[PDB]
Design a protein around this ligand. Sequence first.
Ligand SMILES: OC[C@H]1O[C@@H](O[C@H]2[C@H](O)[C@@H](O)[C@H](O)O[C@@H]2CO)[C@H](O)[C@@H](O)[C@@H]1O
Ligand code: CA
Length: 131
Amino acid sequence: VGGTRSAFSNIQAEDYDSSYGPNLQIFSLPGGGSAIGYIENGYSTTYKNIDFGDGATSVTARVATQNATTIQVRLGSPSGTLLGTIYVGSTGSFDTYRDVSATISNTAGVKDIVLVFSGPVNVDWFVFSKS
Ligand SMILES: OC[C@H]1O[C@@H](O[C@H]2[C@H](O)[C@@H](O)[C@H](O)O[C@@H]2CO)[C@H](O)[C@@H](O)[C@@H]1O
Ligand SMILES: [Ca+2]
């Protein structure tokens, strides 16, 4: 119960262990579950102890936004190694969620992962895979 979280099953974005974001909020979604939002440039959320097993090279995030932005995936801290960058084009509405993917450098073992935001976006969940 509450064991190590797999990188290969959805990680809920609201399930962060630490963050920088004075106005960042968790809120309920109409279709069930929750998202993080009220995000601004330089905000971040950190997810401890994610088990990448013997490696992942892709990330997918379920996101909503009205203006193009990016989400950096970093190792350990907001200033740690940049694993990859998710390019989030508009989904037309902060309430319309779509899946966007990106390549990451091969990440293996149990790792702390940080999402670093460049601008407004709502995030439901994210997950990793081997390309
Ligand atoms: O409308 C919900 C949506 O708001 C987003 O922030 C808006 C904010 O509502 C608006 O009052 C302000 O002027 O602009 C910001 C930035 O676009 C927020 O980022 C979303 O999380 C939220 O879903
Ligand atoms: Ca969620």
